[PDB]
Structures are given as C-alpha cells and as structure tokens.
C-alpha cells in the first residue's frame, strides 16, 4: 500500500496527491510531472518505473542532457486533476514574466528512495506552484488532513514556504481563509522553541505554532534532512505532527482548539492548493518538496502513523549534487572560458566585480592571483564548493542580485548560500558548469565579460539563451598563482 491507499483505508481519502519522486498509490503508473528543456523548449513527462514505483529518473537525465530543465507541472495522482503549475501573481508579484513565480529546476534536489535515484522540487526564493480551481479540497470549515516530505536543512525566514489550502483569488482575504503546512524560521507571526525551522500551520495573517499568536514553546525546531510534516484541521480543532521522514514516529507538537482569535473558528477555507508560497503569493521563501497530499476528512493519528511508517520504508537518502570533473578542498585552480572568441580569458576579478580577463604568463602577479581560486568545501553544502580569492583571502565568489561579486565571508547563512556552487559536467562538453546551490536554475555565466548567476533564459538580459551553454562551460586548469 501507498500513502493514499492508507488514507483511503482510514476513510479520509486523498483529494490531491503530488510527488516528483514516487507514486503515492500502489496502482498509479501515470505521469508524476512534466519537464521542459531550455534547448528547444519541448516537453516530456516522467512516470514511475513500475505501477506504484519510483520515478523514472534516467528518462529525465536523457531528456535534459547538455541543456537545462524546469519542472513545469506536478501532476495530481488522485484523479481529481489538481495538478500544480506555475504560480500566478496575487497580492504580491512573482519575479517572473508578468508577475508569475519561477518554475523550479529539475535537478536541485537529487535523492534515492531505496537505492533508486529520484528528483525532488528544490525551490529557491521566488519559486512557486499553484492550482486555483481544485476539486474535492475542503472549503469553509470542512475537515482535512495533509502532509509533505521536505528538506529540514533548506529554508529561510521569509514568507512563506507552504503546502496546503489557500485562497482561490491569490489574495489575502482574511484570517481563516487558509490552512497549510509551513516550514521555516520566520518569527513575524508564530514560532516555536530554538533557532528553527518550525512546522507551523498557515491560517492566513498568522503562522501558528500553537494556541497563542506568536511564541509557543511546544513547537520544537525540526531540522532533519528529511522531514515529515503532518497537519490537519477540523471543526474547532487542528494539530501539528512532525518526524524524521527517514526514521521513527510522528510526534504531536500541537493538538486542540483553534487559536482563540476572530476569524479562526469557524474557518473559511477556499480550496486552492499552493506550494512554496503564501496565500497572497508572498514568494520570498525557500524549501524542498519531495511528496505530499491533501485529504478530505480529519485523519486519525493511527492513520498518519501508518503513513509515516510507509514513508520511512521508502528510505529517502540524499543523492549526489555533483557530476563531471569536480574539485578537492584546498586545490587552487584557474577557470578558462570555452566560448569561441573568448577562449583566452579566465574568471578573475577587479575589486568586488567578478569578470573574465585575458590572463597569461606576461600578466602581473596581482592579476594572476585575481584569476586564481582556492576551492573549499561548500559553505552551505558539504557536497559542493565555494571559491575563495587567492589575492584576497577571506572573500569568496557570491551571487548578489544575480551578479557574481567577490565579498568577504561574513559568517551568515545568507552569505554561505549565496556562495555555494555545485560542479556539473559542462553543458558544452568542455570542463565544468558551476551550478548555484541555492538557485539550481542558475549557473556561472559570462555576459560581456562579466560573471552572473544566469539561467537559460529569463527576465534579466544576462540570461540570454544565445551562447548559453558555452558561456556556462569552463575548463579547470592549473592556477596562475602557481
Ligand atoms: C533565522 O535563522 C538565521 C540563521 O540562524 C538567522 O540569521 C542571522 O541573521 C542575523 C540577522 O540578519 C545576523 O546578525 C546573524 O549574523 C545571522 N546568523 C546566521 C548563523 O546566519 C535569522 O535572523 C533567523 N531569523 C529570524 C526571523 O529569527
Ligand atoms: O542573487 C540573488 C539574491 O540577491 C540578494 O538579495 C537581494 C534581493 O534579491 C531578490 C532575492 O530573491 C529573488 O527571488 C529576487 O528575484 C531578487 O530580486 O533584492 C533585495 C536586496 O536588498 C537583497 O539583498 C541576495 O544576497 C541573493 O541571494
Ligand atoms: O561574455 C562574453 C560574451 O558576451 C556576449 O556577447 C555578446 C557581445 O558582447 C560583447 C561582449 O564583450 C564586450 O567587450 C563588448 O563590448 C560586447 O559588445 O555583444 C554582441 C552579442 O551578440 C554577443 O552575444 C556573449 O553572450 C558572451 O559569450
């Protein structure tokens, strides 16, 4: 049996079921999600390898070879047609065309479920999916349940990384017009114990960690690499349950009456489904979604425990984020441009500006150093890397407003994430392509001899598809600084 089979057995059936990693029904073999490669913009779908099995990743790899990929649709396996597609603008605008949110990369969250490779939805700030005309989802004060397997080490404090019931207009229509899972360390509304992140329930104009608005000590910080967040709401009652999605039981962080504030009882749910964003399209949060569902009816604890066990059985394990040449901590290198007509340039810098310059044996020692980089263990992820300036030790290459700048490590998480890159086999076949860890849809890319964290097409001029593959491919060579 799969998650939804278990929920059906408990009389609180899935009315929405999403996952880019596995089928949530033992008998599902349809499409899990849709892809679109930047090369020609064509699409293809990825289905389980077998009925009720794991996603066919090799098919994605084949289709996305020598190019980039975005996850255009996350199909609803329940049959209700509640697929998730690019989230539209609302109270707030998205950073994409006409205010839509960004689609997520297809390779930002690699994992294996019991030895079988799969891909999750790595969402960076500005990313988001939605369905404002869903069927079967709870409305008004009707009971519902939900859960999602997320990455407890990928999150921030901006509003709002949710998954659940939201407004059909994409605007904040008031308290009680929402009921969704939230995971992050925002403290603007509710928050629990510790540094975070905390699993809270977004009920509109409030992320609740318990009965009271704001602080509630009963909600602990949960930072497992794989987290199961189980939330449910009914007639003047709701609950929060969390667990290590890779081992053990669900613990109950809250169970009881609605917050005693106007608008929260009875609730006024609207039935829309959001992912990675807030109800009014607040899109500054980040996170990773692997699988999740929404149900009709208040799931019993026994039902959720069975689900949790099934998830544990799925055996989630982190996959490799790196491919191609790759580096070793402490190694000193120089990165050469492979784009025809600039093949003698190297990634260097002029103050905080990271650019490409012609560097050779006649170059001064200062320029040789500006073009030499000490590779160190990724500041935000131990699998990837960070590039430290040879001439200016203590400073690293980081993306700011999508430009690559050479700034000093200020020890903050933000800096750490803006300075972590993952080696990927060069797209043009020559060398490596440094993929941004926090923004997997972006790579090191030179545009008019300046370095940006560019995507294959986008709202910034430096995201041009023209010569993209070449501009994101570099040959790893012996450092000039010897
Ligand atoms: C969420 O957690 C992060 C990481 O613990 C907090 O970030 C720090 O941010 C402050 C305010 O910008 C800086 O003084 C610190 O140097 C940062 N520390 C680290 C370790 O990054 C962030 O403030 C927390 N957010 C909330 C709302 O509590
Ligand atoms: O390199 C991208 C981010 O720029 C810096 O943040 C600045 C922020 O940027 C927004 C970040 O979120 C994206 O979704 C938006 O598309 C982008 O505009 O704009 C306001 C500035 O005051 C922030 O410093 C971050 O350092 C970096 O991660
Ligand atoms: O990053 C180097 C190349 O820039 C982009 O090229 C475009 C070219 O840009 C020139 C880049 O070099 C500066 O010194 C020049 O002042 C500037 O004109 O302009 C014409 C466009 O058609 C080129 O694509 C390429 O993307 C990149 O390889």
CATH of the domain at 58: 2.60.120.200
Residues 58 and 140 in one domain: yes
- The verdict on 364 and 294 lying in the same domain is no
Q: Mark which of 320, 345, 367 sits at the end of a domain.
A: 320
**Same-domain pairing of 291 and 339:** no
Domain count, the chain: 2
Together in a domain, 315 and 358: no
Task: Identify the helix (H) or strand (E) that includes residue 116.
Answer: strand 116-123
Domain boundary at 305, 320, 335, which?
320
Please tell me whether residues 290 and 353 are part of one structural domain. no
312: helix, coil or strand? helix
- Kindly give the number of the ligand 2 atom that is closest to the alpha carbon of 453: 1
Burial track 303-334 (b if 16+ CB lie within 10 A, e otherwise): bbbbbbebbbebbbebbebbbeebbeeeebbb
- Domain residues for the domain of 56 are 1-320
* Same domain membership, residue 325 and residue 294: no
| Alpha helix stretches (DSSP H) within 32-191 | 57-63
Secondary structure of residue 148 in the 3-state scheme:
strand
Q: Contact 390/373 with Cβ under 8 angstroms? A: yes
Q: Which residues of 54-93 are buried (b: 16+ CB within 10 A; e: fewer)?
A: bbbbeebeebbeeebbbbbbbbbbbebebbbbbbbbbebe
Q: Are 101 and 283 spatial neighbours (Cβ–Cβ below 8 Å)?
A: yes
Do 438 and 480 lie in one domain? The reply is: yes
Q: What separation in Å is there between the alpha carbon of 127 and the centre of ligand 1?
A: 22
CA angle at 120 for the pair 101 and 250, rounded to the nearest 5°: 110
To one decimal, the resolution in angstroms is 2.3
Q: What is the CATH number of the domain that holds 389?
A: 2.80.10.50
Are 33 and 133 part of one and the same domain?
yes
Report d(CA 160, CA 300) in Å as an integer. Answer: 27
- Which of 336, 339, 448 best tests ligand 3's pocket when mutated (most atoms within 8 Å of CB)? 448
Question: 408 and 314 in one domain?
Answer: no
Atom 13, ligand 1: which residue's CA is nearest? Answer: 412
Are residues 401 and 264 part of one domain? no
Helical ranges in 128-262 per DSSP H: none
335 and 246 in a common domain:
no
Give residue ranges with CB within 6 A of ligand 1.
Answer: 157, 185-187, 195-196, 412-413
Point out the domain boundary residue: 290, 320, 350. Answer: 320
Residue 377 Cα to ligand 1 midpoint, Å, equals 21
Residue with the smallest CA separation from ligand 2 atom 12 is 125
302 and 286, same structural domain?
A: yes
DSSP E strands: which ranges in 13-91? 14-19, 33-37, 43-46, 69-74, 84-86
């Amino acid at each position: 049996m799969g998650p939804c089979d278990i929920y059906e057995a408990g009389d609180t059936p899935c009315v929405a079921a999403h996952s880019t990693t596995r089928a949530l029904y033992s008998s599902f073999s349809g499409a899990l999600y849709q892809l679109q490669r930047g090369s020609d913009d064509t699409t293809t779908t990825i289905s389980p390898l077998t009925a009720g099995g794991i996603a066919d990743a090799s098919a994605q790899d084949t289709f996305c070879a020598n190019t980039t990929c975005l996850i255009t649709i996350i199909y609803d396996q329940s049959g209700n047609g509640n697929h998730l597609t690019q989230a539209p603008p609302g109270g707030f605008d998205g950073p994409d065309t006409d205010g839509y949110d960004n689609l997520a990369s297809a390779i930002g969250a690699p994992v294996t479920l019991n030895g079988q490779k799969a891909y999750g939805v790595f969402m960076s700030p500005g990313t988001g999916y939605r369905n404002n005309e869903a069927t079967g989802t709870a409305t008004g004060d009707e009971a519902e349940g939900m859960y999602a397997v997320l990455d407890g080490t990928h999150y921030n404090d901006a509003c709002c990384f949710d998954y659940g019931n939201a407004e059909t207009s994409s605007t904040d229509t008031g308290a009680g017009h929402m009921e969704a899972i939230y995971l992050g360390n925002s403290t603007t509304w509710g928050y629990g114990a510790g540094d975070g992140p905390w699993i809270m329930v977004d009920m509109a104009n409030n992320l609740f960690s318990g009965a009271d608005e704001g602080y509630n000590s009963g909600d602990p910080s949960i930072s497992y690499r794989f987290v199961t967040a189980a939330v449910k709401g009914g007639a003047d009652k709701w609950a929060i349950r969390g667990a290590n999605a890779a081992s053990g039981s669900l613990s109950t962080y809250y169970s009881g009456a609605r917050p005693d504030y106007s608008g929260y009882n009875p609730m006024s749910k609207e039935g829309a489904i959001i992912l990675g964003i807030g109800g009014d399209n607040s899109n500054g949060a980040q996170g990773t979604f692997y699988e999740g569902v929404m149900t009709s009816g208040y799931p019993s604890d026994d039902t959720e425990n069975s689900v949790q066990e099934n998830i544990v059985a799925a055996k989630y394990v982190v996959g490799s984020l790196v491919s191609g040449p790759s580096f070793t901590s402490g190694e000193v290198v120089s990165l050469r441009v492979t784009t025809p007509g600039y093949t003698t340039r190297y990634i260097a810098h002029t103050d905080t500006t990271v650019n490409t310059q012609v560097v050779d044996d006649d170059s001064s020692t200062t320029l040789k150093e500006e073009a030499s980089w000490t590779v160190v263990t990724g500041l935000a992820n131990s699998q990837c890397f960070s590039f430290e300036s040879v001439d200016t030790p203590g400073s690293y290459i980081r993306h700011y407003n999508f430009e690559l700048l050479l700034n000093a490590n200020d020890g903050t998480k933000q800096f750490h994430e803006d300075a972590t890159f993952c080696p990927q086999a060069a797209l043009n076949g020559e060398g490596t392509s440094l993929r941004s860890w926090s923004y997997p849809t972006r790579y090191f890319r030179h545009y008019e001899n300046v370095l940006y964290a560019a995507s294959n097409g986008g709202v910034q001029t430096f995201d041009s598809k023209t010569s993209f593959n070449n501009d994101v491919s570099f040959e790893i060579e012996t450092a000039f600084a010897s």
